[PDB]
Design a protein around this ligand. Structure first.
Ligand code: PLP
Ligand code: PLP
Lengths: 379, 389
């Protein structure tokens, strides 16, 4: 039996009970709202994590790279949305996946990218399914929600060009800057309204738009109503993290991903315990620094997963993390509290960034045993 | 010529690779390798490169061919990979955890001349007890704290030096030396401050070695270094070797510290423009923080490069454009000075390929399974690197 006492450190540990609670909470909310859940696997890139999301009721997946679409298709998942503005040079890759039987959907937000897809699709005999990305909050990519002329020009380029105009999507990722239920509820409504308005504008122009897809984890969990929406995309919620805790959509005790670390030394005068989880284990993500509670490079928990308020990783080098008091004081006799060899678990600022540092997760069962769940690295 | 014809037809260049990709400019890397080795040769000290920046066999092979002596690793997985590749002289330069002793023993039993470090009496007792139990005289160095950065015994803490040194020597282990790493050098940016810190690091490590020797304890190696202090030390009297790693590529944090120029940076991320927000002057690229890493070490330095400095396809800097924001798989390219470029779509057309210089070469490299090693002829070769532990 591998267990938390036998693993080498650092290790990325998924508490499966916490993961299952998070999976149930999101699926039950999307059912309450009358929409499908299309989880975004870029958080975990792991076949068994996505399998648990599908078993609870999810419908298809969202991926952030074509490498994830290859991985998940090779595992039997065919309903795949690649939710990053399509690069024309990746069209041969996308064509090969569709010819193989993957129902791979692409997105675009410009006439030039829509023309490149439709021209290549006609040449190769492929009616690509393409969704139009809508910018509903100024966060990133997308056609402005009131830019009707651009929306229609892209829609007619796809539809008149022989492609399948499959829907519109938006991602209100500016939700990550918010931290009150009122602000999140309001942004969720702006995301819903803007995505529904773009669908209605396509329809009113006689163009097909069967899918309306919205979501980020915080807006998924905050939306009061989702009229007009057919699916919500969310991914980080499967594990949560401290940035999500600060946004206010979970508690620290809901975070299912932690990094198992061993105490390898101390600086007694400074009240530091040095652990073997540095920034190569945690990642350089410091999202909580700009939030109302800064957790440094992570929140310390004991080996049982009990949060230890007031101890965080105040600093990190590549393979060394510095555990110390959040209150700035030099904990007296730090080595007496955390002897050499003590194992601790660190909750991450950002679950997708920390998970991508590891070749695999250690999925922790109720009996204390672990099973290794590989995940994807690279492109 | 069957092999020849098939090989050509399969050769990648910067035009055919998928993006993002981590590209090493081999000519720049070789200048970096030569420069550090020449400096250590001129000081009469060994260079023991730290492979944690690249974790790539052919990069360490270039360092060894240039004259390096052994390597430094940050994990036992690195020691396993490089020993399998034929590197026998390996220093594991992270405070040794007792639970890793069986793996260290197996590596030594297979022929790896693996050196461990400690900075505590309890760690030295654990190594000596296991070495007695297993019939192994481990070689252990004592880590010295010469600048307040991280691990190590204070250079002037004689009683703790001797306690640890005697625990190892009386315990039947080989007390092989002292080492220090003056990582506070990353907060400096003037040659005055760097030269003075390099002198503090040399003086403190040598002080500890002299105190052990004055107690009758062996201490034949004195090992110092960070890339900034390796490049700044005036003198290395009393030092046997210098360890440096990031110099093999450099990055924008090193450029800001002042120990290289942006044109010495050998690692860049190849990216494609996939979109725009013309009214905000944004080009959107397919290198987000998953490609660049979340490192923002330049944010506190004299020039903030956001998530990386934009260069053209030929690798030349495009002044004033940086990645100002990054999400997982999207980077936001825009003016450093916060003006909205007019006509951003004509400046950076959809499908244009760019190269992004990183804040931190070790952090960006770790995001990739492999580097694309770019030769003078524009040909690339895939150079695998290690991920995980
Ligand atoms: C990552 C992502 C999501 C899921 O949002 P999270 O807040 O990461 O759960 C949805 N849509 C798109 C386009 C994304 O990139
Ligand atoms: C990384 C490291 C080095 C090399 O320093 P760079 O500034 O990273 O070149 C040397 N010694 C130790 C102990 C290190 O961790």
């Amino acid at each position: 039996q591998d267990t938390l006492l036998t693993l080498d450190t650092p290790a990325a540990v998924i508490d499966l009970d916490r993961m299952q609670r998070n999976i149930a909470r999101m699926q039950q909310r999307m059912d309450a709202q009358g929409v499908r859940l299309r989880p975004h696997v870029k958080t975990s890139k792991s076949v068994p994590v996505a399998a648990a999301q599908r078993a609870a009721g999810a419908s298809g997946i969202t991926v952030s790279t074509l490498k994830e679409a290859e991985q998940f298709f090779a595992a039997g998942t065919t309903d795949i949305l690649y939710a990053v503005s399509m690069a024309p040079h990746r069209l041969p890759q996308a064509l090969q996946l569709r010819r193989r039987g993957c129902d791979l959907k692409l997105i675009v937000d410009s006439v030039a990218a829509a023309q490149a897809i439709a021209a290549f699709g006609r040449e190769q005999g492929e009616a690509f399914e393409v969704w139009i990305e809508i910018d509903t909050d100024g966060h990133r990519s997308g056609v402005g929600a009131d830019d009707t002329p651009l929306l229609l020009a892209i829609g007619r380029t796809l539809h008149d060009g022989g492609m399948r105009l499959g829907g519109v999507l938006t991602h209100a990722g500016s939700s990550y800057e918010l931290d009150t239920p009122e602000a999140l509820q309001a942004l969720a409504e702006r995301e819903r309204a803007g995505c529904v308005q773009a669908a209605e504008a396509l329809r009113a122009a006689g163009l097909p738009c069967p899918v309306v897809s919205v979501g980020s984890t915080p807006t998924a969990l905050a939306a009061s109503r989702l009229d007009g929406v057919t699916e919500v995309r969310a991914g980080v919620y499967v594990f949560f993290d401290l940035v999500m805790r600060n946004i206010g959509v979970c508690a620290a005790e809901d975070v299912a991903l932690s990094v198992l670390a061993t105490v390898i030394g101390h600086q007694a005068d400074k009240g530091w315990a040095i652990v073997d989880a540095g920034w190569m284990a945690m990642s350089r993500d410091r999202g909580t620094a700009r939030q109302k509670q800064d957790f440094g490079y992570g929140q310390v928990c004991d080996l049982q997963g009990r949060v230890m308020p007031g101890f965080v990783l105040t600093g990190a080098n590549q393979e060394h993390g510095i555990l110390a008091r959040a209150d700035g004081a030099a904990e007296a006799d730090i080595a007496t509290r955390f002897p050499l060899g003590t194992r601790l678990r660190i909750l991450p600022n950002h679950a997708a960034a920390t998970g991508a540092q590891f070749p695999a997760y250690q999925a922790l069962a109720a009996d204390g045993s672990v099973q290794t769940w590989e995940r994807l690295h690279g492109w």
